[PDB]
Enzyme design. Structure first.
Site, short mmCIF file in Angstrom:
data_model
loop_
_atom_site.label_atom_id
_atom_site.label_comp_id
_atom_site.label_asym_id
_atom_site.label_seq_id
_atom_site.Cartn_x
_atom_site.Cartn_y
_atom_site.Cartn_z
N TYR A 1 11.17 3.79 -6.22
CA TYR A 1 9.83 3.64 -6.73
C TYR A 1 9.86 3.45 -8.25
CZ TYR A 1 8.47 5.47 -2.15
OH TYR A 1 8.36 5.59 -0.79
N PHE B 1 -0.43 1.88 6.14
CA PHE B 1 -1.26 2.61 5.19
C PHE B 1 -2.72 2.36 5.54
CE2 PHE B 1 2.44 1.75 2.40
CZ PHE B 1 2.59 2.99 1.74
N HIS C 1 -0.37 7.11 3.99
CA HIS C 1 0.20 6.94 5.32
C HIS C 1 -0.54 7.85 6.31
CE1 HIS C 1 3.56 4.28 4.60
NE2 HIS C 1 4.06 5.06 3.65
N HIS D 1 8.04 0.30 -6.29
CA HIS D 1 8.56 -0.91 -5.68
C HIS D 1 7.42 -1.78 -5.21
CE1 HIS D 1 8.57 1.42 -1.69
NE2 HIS D 1 7.82 0.37 -1.43
N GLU E 1 3.78 -0.07 -5.46
CA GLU E 1 3.32 1.26 -5.06
C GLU E 1 4.13 2.36 -5.77
OE1 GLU E 1 4.56 2.84 -1.29
OE2 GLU E 1 4.92 0.84 -0.48
N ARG F 1 -0.08 7.09 -2.23
CA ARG F 1 0.41 6.14 -3.24
C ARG F 1 -0.70 5.53 -4.09
NH1 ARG F 1 4.01 8.15 -0.91
NH2 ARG F 1 5.39 7.17 0.61
N1 LIG Z 1 3.21 -0.74 4.93
C1 LIG Z 1 3.71 -1.55 3.99
N2 LIG Z 1 4.99 -1.48 3.64
C2 LIG Z 1 5.38 -2.35 2.68
C3 LIG Z 1 4.59 -3.25 2.05
N3 LIG Z 1 5.33 -3.99 1.12
C4 LIG Z 1 6.56 -3.53 1.21
N4 LIG Z 1 6.67 -2.52 2.16
C5 LIG Z 1 7.93 -1.91 2.66
O1 LIG Z 1 8.07 -2.25 4.07
C6 LIG Z 1 8.73 -1.23 4.82
C7 LIG Z 1 7.84 -0.82 5.97
O2 LIG Z 1 6.56 -0.27 5.62
C8 LIG Z 1 9.00 -0.13 3.81
O3 LIG Z 1 10.29 -0.31 3.20
P1 LIG Z 1 10.06 0.36 1.78
O4 LIG Z 1 10.86 -0.56 0.94
S1 LIG Z 1 10.74 2.08 1.37
O5 LIG Z 1 8.49 -0.05 1.38
C9 LIG Z 1 7.92 -0.38 2.63
C10 LIG Z 1 3.22 -3.31 2.42
O6 LIG Z 1 2.36 -4.07 1.96
N5 LIG Z 1 2.86 -2.42 3.41
#
Ligand SMILES: Nc1nc2c(ncn2[C@@H]2O[C@H](CO)[C@H]3O[P@](O)(=S)O[C@H]32)c(=O)[nH]1
Length: 104
Positions: free
Chosen positions: A38, A100, A92, A40, A58, A77
Site C-alpha cells: 500500500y 468493496f 470490504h 496500490h 487505495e 480504505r
Molecule cells: N476489489 C477490487 N480489488 C482491486 C481493484 N483494483 C485492484 N484490486 C486488487 O485485485 C485483487 C482482488 O480484489 C486484490 O489484489 P490486491 O493487489 S492486494 O488489490 C486487490 C478494484 O478496483 N477492486
C-alpha cells in the site's frame, strides 16, 4: 460525527484526511508498506461513480485512529487520485469475496 460509516466503524473527515495525507506521501515518494504494498492501484472494478478522475489508489484507514504502517490492513480504505483528491471511502465489510462497498 460519523462523517463516514464503514460497517460499524465511524470516521470523521479529519480521520480520513489524515489517512489520505499519509498514503499520498508514500505514493509520491514511490514507497509502499505492508505485504499488499500500500498504497496500490485501485482499478474500480466495482464501478463506483467517483467524481474525481483516476488513476485511483487505495490506502488503509484504521478504526484505532492510528495511521497504517505495514501490518494488518483491516477492511476499510480511503481511495485518492494523483491530484491528491479524495475519491471516496470504501470497505470490504458487507461485501462478498474481495469486493468493496462504499462507506455511507
Ligand atoms: N476489489 C477490487 N480489488 C482491486 C481493484 N483494483 C485492484 N484490486 C486488487 O485485485 C485483487 C482482488 O480484489 C486484490 O489484489 P490486491 O493487489 S492486494 O488489490 C486487490 C478494484 O478496483 N477492486
Amino acid at each position: 460525527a460519523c462523517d463516514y460509516t464503514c460497517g460499524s466503524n465511524c470516521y470523521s473527515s479529519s480521520d480520513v484526511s489524515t489517512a489520505q495525507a499519509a498514503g499520498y506521501k508514500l505514493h509520491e515518494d514511490g514507497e509502499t508498506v505492508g505485504s499488499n504494498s500500500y498504497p496500490h492501484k485501485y482499478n474500480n472494478y466495482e464501478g463506483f461513480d467517483f467524481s474525481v478522475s483516476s488513476p485511483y489508489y487505495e490506502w488503509p484507514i484504521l478504526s484505532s485512529g492510528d495511521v497504517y504502517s505495514g501490518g494488518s490492513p483491516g477492511a476499510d480504505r480511503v481511495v485518492f487520485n494523483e491530484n491528491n483528491q479524495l475519491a471516496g471511502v470504501i470497505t470490504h465489510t458487507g461485501a462478498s469475496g474481495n469486493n468493496f462497498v462504499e462507506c455511507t
